[PDB]
Amino acid sequence: KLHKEPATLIKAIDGDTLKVMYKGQPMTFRLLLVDTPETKHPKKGVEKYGPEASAFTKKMLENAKKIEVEFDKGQRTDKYGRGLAYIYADGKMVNEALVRQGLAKVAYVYKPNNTHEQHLRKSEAQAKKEKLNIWS
Q1: What angle do CA 118, 101, 111 make, to 5 degrees?
Q2: Ranges of each domain in the chain
Q3: Residue 92 neighbours by CB under 8 Å, 6+ apart
Q4: Residue 117: C-alpha distances to residues 45, 67, 96 (Å)
Q5: Which of 136, 81, 72 is nearest to 110 (CA)?
Q6: Does 82 participate in catalysis according to the annotation?
Q7: Backbone angles phi, psi at 120, to 5 degrees
Q8: Which entry of 52, 70, 76, 82 is annotated as an active-site residue?
Q9: Contact at 8 Å (CB) between 42 and 33?
Q10: Calpha distance 64→47 (Å, rounded)
Q11: How far apart are CA 50 and CA 38, in angstroms?
């Protein structure tokens, strides 16, 4: 059973990565299950819809009253020390909002961190069917 925990925005870094104050410490979070185009991609740098994905996550988190983090049932950090979570702005899941707008694809999924996988896949199918952004 997953639960939401409160957090405080520090700074949105990219479409898929946000720095947040969690249990009293600054920590970088990577959004579970989604791949956004990147503005600071390691080899590629600035990719198409990268700035759009970045602005969308930024606006959503910065304008929220309440930001919450929800860990999945598996590992809670990746190999770079980033928290792996679903992030909610005023009760809306950011991870889902991105996929629903055609600003992210559903990532390759690693069990047991796959709880909302079906839900995200459905939004992705909708965004493809609507030909939004990445899908047009």
Answers
A1: 25
A2: 1-136
A3: 60
A4: 28, 21, 10
A5: 72
A6: yes
A7: -65, -40
A8: 82
A9: no
A10: 27
A11: 5
**What would the two tokens of residue 107 be?**
């990532």
Q: Which three-class secondary structure state does DSSP give residue 90? A: coil
Reported resolution, Å: 1.6
Asked if 30 is an active-site residue, the reply is yes
What is the dihedral angle through the alpha carbons of 9, 13, 15, 21, rounded to the nearest 10 degrees?
-20
Known active-site residue 121: no
Name the method of structure determination: X-ray
Answer whether 60's CB lies under 8 Å from 94's CB. yes
CA distance 128 to 7: 32
How big is the chain, counted in residues? 136
Q: Which residue has the tokens 């809670």?
A: 76
Binding-site entries for Ca(2+): 16, 35-36
The half-sphere exposure of 131 on its side-chain side, counting CA atoms within 13 A, is 1
H helix runs in the chain, sequence order: 50-62, 94-100, 117-129
Question: Does the domain made of 1-136 have the CATH classification 2.40.50.90?
Answer: yes
The annotation places the binding site at 16, 35-36
Find where tokens 């965004």 sit.
127
Structure tokens at 135: 């899908």
